[PDB]
């Protein structure tokens, strides 16, 4: 998982 990708639902 890219750390900058969407961390939300």
């Amino acid at each position, epitope marked *: 998982v890219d750390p900058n990708a969407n961390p*939300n639902v």
Partner: antibody, heavy 125, light 107 residues
Framework: QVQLVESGGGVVQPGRSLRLSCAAS????????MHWVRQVPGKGLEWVAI????????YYADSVKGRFSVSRDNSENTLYLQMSNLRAEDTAVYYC??????????????????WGQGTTVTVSS | DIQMTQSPSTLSASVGDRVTITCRAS??????LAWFQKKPGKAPKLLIY???NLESGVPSRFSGSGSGTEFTLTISSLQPDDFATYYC????????FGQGTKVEVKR
């Protein structure tokens, strides 16, 4: 009324541990990724850690990796930062920051939007 | 390993002056750049997201532009509330901030 309130800041001796908390209100804490950002005296703002909305993914900055642990409790709307093996360089104001949240969340790479007022952690013997 | 540089470090200006502060990235970050405002003793507030898009409630006098390595934050008419420090932040590869730019009162 998105509000993030930090707590647990204070004095901690080097090599010891301290846990910070962040109370979240005004939004759905369970639906948002959260960040920890710190500002060491003199030095500029530096990102510490990020945790996913479900707690499944966590990433850390190299300076705190292996000593710092980010956690969350979505049933209590609280974010956590466990700091261990603390050093004087870890003395800073720590901010609880919300990841960017939009209803039309069609973005590829996400940053931060709302910060908390922050809490001070003083590491000294 | 993305460094953010801001010029100038301290900007002297007056009320009503058009103010422009520049932010440079060590590599191309496309438009994944954000501008924050921090007044002393207060928490940073996000003004501009995706390099140019203004955030909700942010006054229309604030403006941002750029794509790649060079970015700017422009205040067309400087107001008293606008005297503070501004940070740029990239969110492509982790999150790094610029050293900050203080807008002081010219005298």
């Amino acid at each position: 009324q998105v509000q993030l309130v930090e707590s647990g800041g204070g004095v901690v001796q080097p090599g010891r541990s301290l846990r910070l908390s962040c109370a979240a209100s005004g939004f759905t804490f369970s639906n948002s990724g959260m960040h920890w950002v710190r500002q060491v005296p003199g030095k500029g703002l530096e990102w510490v850690a990020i945790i996913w909305y479900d707690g499944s993914n966590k990433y850390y900055a190299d300076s705190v990796k292996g000593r710092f642990s980010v956690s969350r409790d979505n049933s209590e709307n609280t974010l956590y930062l466990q700091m261990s093996n603390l050093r004087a360089e870890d003395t800073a104001v720590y901010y609880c920051v919300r990841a960017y949240f939009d209803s039309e969340n069609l973005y590829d790479y996400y940053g931060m939007d709302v910060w908390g007022q922050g809490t001070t952690v003083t590491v000294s013997s | 390993d993305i460094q953010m540089t801001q010029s100038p470090s301290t900007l002297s200006a007056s009320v009503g002056d058009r103010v422009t502060i520049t932010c440079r990235a060590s590599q191309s970050i496309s438009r994944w750049l954000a501008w924050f405002q921090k007044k002393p003793g207060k928490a940073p507030k996000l003004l501009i997201y995706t390099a140019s898009n203004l955030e909700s409630g942010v006054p229309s006098r604030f403006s941002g532009s750029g794509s790649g390595t060079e970015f700017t934050l422009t205040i067309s008419s400087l107001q008293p509330d606008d005297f503070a420090t501004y940070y740029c932040q990239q969110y492509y590869n982790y999150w790094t901030f610029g050293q900050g730019t203080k807008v002081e009162v010219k005298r």
